[PDB]
Nucleic acid binder design. Sequence first.
RNA 1: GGCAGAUCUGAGCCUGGGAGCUCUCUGCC
Length: 14
Amino acid sequence: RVRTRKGRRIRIXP
RNA sequence: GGCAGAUCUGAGCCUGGGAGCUCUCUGCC
């Protein structure tokens, strides 16, 4: 999974 | 009862410069 946190890039596994 | 998503539109350390983690929540038979 790939998402963005507080504008930052956060990725979690798939 | 276990599973599956979500980041400010989920937060916490950023060790994040984001595959780093960490935790909570919802519906199913």
